Amino acid sequence: NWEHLLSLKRQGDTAKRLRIEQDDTRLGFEVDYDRIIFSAPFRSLQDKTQVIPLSKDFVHTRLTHSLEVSVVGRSLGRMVGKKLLEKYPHLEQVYGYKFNDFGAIVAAAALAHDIGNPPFGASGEKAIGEFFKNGYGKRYKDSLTAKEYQDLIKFEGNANGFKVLSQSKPGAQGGLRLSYATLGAFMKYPKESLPHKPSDHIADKKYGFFQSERALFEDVAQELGLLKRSTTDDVSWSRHPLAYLVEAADDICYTIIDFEDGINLGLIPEEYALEYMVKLVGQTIDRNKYNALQETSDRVSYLRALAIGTLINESVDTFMKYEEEILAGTFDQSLIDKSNYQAQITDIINLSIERIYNSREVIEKEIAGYEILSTLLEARCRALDNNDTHYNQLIQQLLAPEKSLYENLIQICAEVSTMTDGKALRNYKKIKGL
Amino acid sequence: NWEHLLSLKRQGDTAKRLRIEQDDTRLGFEVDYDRIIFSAPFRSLQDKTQVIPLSKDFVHTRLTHSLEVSVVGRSLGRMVGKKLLEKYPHLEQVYGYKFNDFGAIVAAAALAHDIGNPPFGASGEKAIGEFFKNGYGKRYKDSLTAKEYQDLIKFEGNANGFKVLSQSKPGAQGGLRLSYATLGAFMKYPKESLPHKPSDHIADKKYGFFQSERALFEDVAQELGLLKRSTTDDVSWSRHPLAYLVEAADDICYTIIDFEDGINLGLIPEEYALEYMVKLVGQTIDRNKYNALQETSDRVSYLRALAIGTLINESVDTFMKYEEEILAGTFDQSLIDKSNYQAQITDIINLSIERIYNSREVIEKEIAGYEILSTLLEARCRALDNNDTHYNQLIQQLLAPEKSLYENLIQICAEVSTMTDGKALRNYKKIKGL
Ligand SMILES: Nc1nc2c(ncn2[C@H]2C[C@H](O)[C@@H](COP(=O)(O)OP(=O)(O)OP(=O)(O)O)O2)c(=O)[nH]1
Ligand SMILES: Nc1nc2c(ncn2[C@H]2C[C@H](O)[C@@H](COP(=O)(O)OP(=O)(O)OP(=O)(O)O)O2)c(=O)[nH]1
Ligand SMILES: Nc1ncnc2c1ncn2[C@H]1C[C@H](O)[C@@H](COP(=O)(O)OP(=O)(O)OP(=O)(O)O)O1
Ligand SMILES: Nc1ncnc2c1ncn2[C@H]1C[C@H](O)[C@@H](COP(=O)(O)OP(=O)(O)OP(=O)(O)O)O1
Ligand SMILES: [Mg+2]
Ligand SMILES: [Mg+2]
Ligand SMILES: [Mg+2]
Ligand SMILES: [Mg+2]
């Protein structure tokens, strides 16, 4: 039920924090927002790849993408919360909740939803995985549990993001110490790395936490009241209802903005821009304003602003139509896939894949990223092995100012993923002496 | 005794050169000085690392360090020689020696005391060793004698310096053909590479000659009358008395100048400069002059000039107090370790280690040096193996305008150590085509 889903608990708490005992100027979710804003992991997003590597231009990075997702998520959360308190009046009438709380939760979750991504993006994650699969790290296969090896060979940015958010350090336990509602709404694949893709459900495409933090998530999963889907030997719970909204906001934003940026770069003609969006923007377009503009940028910006407004309302309608199934855990798709504009979205995505992801420029950067990440990971792993050599001591002093082998390897992968693109490239040249 | 220690013999001589038959304008030790000054190995010291690699700035290189050590050694030798001829009048009264001869010997020995060091310094030597230990060169372990392999895996700059000084070439035997007193005073570890650190004595921390020149040193060791410390299967003699003075001069100079340069660079505050040297400079400091100066450079230069003058006199006193033990071979430490200022010296050294050697700047350069040296050594060794390939012929023509395997490997290591830092880096890029 909804009372346990909006928990204000933080790690290490003993008492019970109640909504009616909060300070209304600064609620806990706003504190979460402010704690994410002021941290270094959030700042490192400014020079991390969204689509085009090493482009910190007029193209998007992870930071600006996260900000746009935050705005869209705040809007979605406010509408859905107003409709929910309309449906269940006891929430507001007894517990003391307002529709701004839902917006704060979704905004905070959407702000930190990519905070664990490594440099170079998808190619970076695949390179980290291939290093342990077919490279040097393969030699560790026999020393590790099967699920730990699966963690290392299918490295996921979501698990690393959870690790960053809930990291324990000497003298400061809990990390950022976010609320449990925010951690639940941030969590989109509540399962371990094995088994690999059991079903066709949407919460099974990947995994969301490592083996070193499973216990932590267990605590979270038992406070919110999430339904359990497996207890044999591998735990898996159902989604928090607001993770659907977070995912919808992320999908809308990147789907539209990638097209707009590709048009502005010179890779997609504007005829496609009008053709694939006339249906989306037809219900609110004022042709006069469209015909007055004299630049491609103004036209594409107008079209994007209209399309986002249409899609947000459609998503809210879908969520309120399937609320019961979502709360019961039986809803196996995304809110976007149940929309009237699926064909247009698929056409835009296919055009983006053909014209942007496979561009020469984009390709060369990913190959360079593969080389850089492999070099840095091999250096760290060889330093971890010997430990007695002078060279090993130098590498330790440069790249790292009692734990198990799995903990050491996962820490190595986490430290590689903190770097930006430029810092990784600079370290690569310094290692090579170039 | 002292008559045989000041020998004027050169390699290949048949007759006996006597001191009273010399030309007083140009004695043999001055000829040694002039022969070292005009050679190419001495010139290559201008772009070789002392502390900070690739800094040929206002920081020291090996050449300027060697010049300062030469000045301090000349002073020490003159004082000790005057006191010795005071103690033993028969030297001057019969053989015809003057106290300038001791200064000439110590100056010539201190001028060439680092002439065998490779590029990048201590990290360079360790890289050359690690190449044979854990790298490609390990494959030769089974083809070599144990002492030869120990030579190759504990590569020493002192042995390479002896090799440079006493190198035989077609048409010119003996190399620079220095006097035997100078060669003895240059020699600080008269032993082979095995056994490794037998005792806690000071002449056992390392080794001083390779297996290809052992015979040569034997000749020297039998002309001076050095005492023998082992004859089972590994030869080891005692130190020439003036090697103590050479080592004292080297220690004083680098200990003070490293601190001064670190202060001038911006890595050590000046408060430490006054705190750790007030005791050293207290007996001769004129506060008026110190308070008149208005720059950090002038103050640190004043303090250094006072400290060197104090330490020189203390070292002379220690040498004359323990002369009998030194001549008997029973003196197991250095003249610096028997001084009243050991605590201040240790504090300055520890500060230098924490603040200069482990700086980021310093660290990155050493890692690059490791990469460069490993690449060049592997290329030379692979050229030495196959010999029939076209690529091998090209590498031979580029890097080298009937001998055993050990001779070939030691010649490879000697040719790598002739390069400066810049030349090694340029060759590395040319090999990589960058
Ligand atoms: N350059 C390049 N970019 C790609 C590729 N695949 C995806 N992208 C970029 C374009 C999208 O704007 C961006 C979205 O990345 P996400 O990790 O957020 O993807 P997704 O929504 O599938 O999220 P997920 O990790 O599955 O929850 O990734 C690719 O193969 N190459
Ligand atoms: N960058 C760097 N410099 C070092 C390190 N260790 C020593 N040095 C530098 C600082 C000293 O001024 C300089 C002295 O080198 P030497 O080879 O003359 O040393 P030492 O007096 O121990 O002579 P030795 O070869 O044992 O007779 O070496 C190190 O780990 N890193
Ligand atoms: N409903 C919404 N909620 C949140 N963000 C939105 C919404 N609609 C659009 N956005 C995003 C994308 C737009 O470029 C940007 C500004 O929105 P907005 O000013 O309402 O758009 P617009 O230019 O279509 O205005 P209008 O509807 O007044 O003509 O915010
Ligand atoms: N006794 C010495 N013998 C040889 N070199 C020395 C001696 N003392 C110092 N040095 C070195 C380091 C000094 O910076 C440099 C010049 O010495 P010097 O001019 O005597 O020093 P100073 O500035 O202390 O002079 P003074 O004693 O006249 O005040 O030579
Ligand atoms: Mg995102
Ligand atoms: Mg609008
Ligand atoms: Mg020296
Ligand atoms: Mg003086």
PDB file of C-alpha atoms and ligand atoms in Angstrom, chain A residues 50 62 65-66 69 110 113-114 117 250 254, ligand 5:
ATOM      1  CA  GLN A  50      25.669  10.805 -23.598  1.00  0.00           C
ATOM      2  CA  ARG A  62      25.018  13.358 -18.870  1.00  0.00           C
ATOM      3  CA  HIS A  65      20.324  15.275 -19.799  1.00  0.00           C
ATOM      4  CA  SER A  66      19.828  14.560 -16.093  1.00  0.00           C
ATOM      5  CA  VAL A  69      14.850  14.450 -17.013  1.00  0.00           C
ATOM      6  CA  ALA A 110      15.622  11.274 -11.927  1.00  0.00           C
ATOM      7  CA  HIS A 113      19.572   8.056 -12.324  1.00  0.00           C
ATOM      8  CA  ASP A 114      22.795   7.941 -14.345  1.00  0.00           C
ATOM      9  CA  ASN A 117      27.758   5.392 -15.681  1.00  0.00           C
ATOM     10  CA  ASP A 250      14.197   9.306 -19.309  1.00  0.00           C
ATOM     11  CA  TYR A 254      16.574  11.145 -24.784  1.00  0.00           C
TER      12      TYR A 254
HETATM   13 MG    MG C   5      19.462   9.089 -18.346  1.00  0.00          MG
END
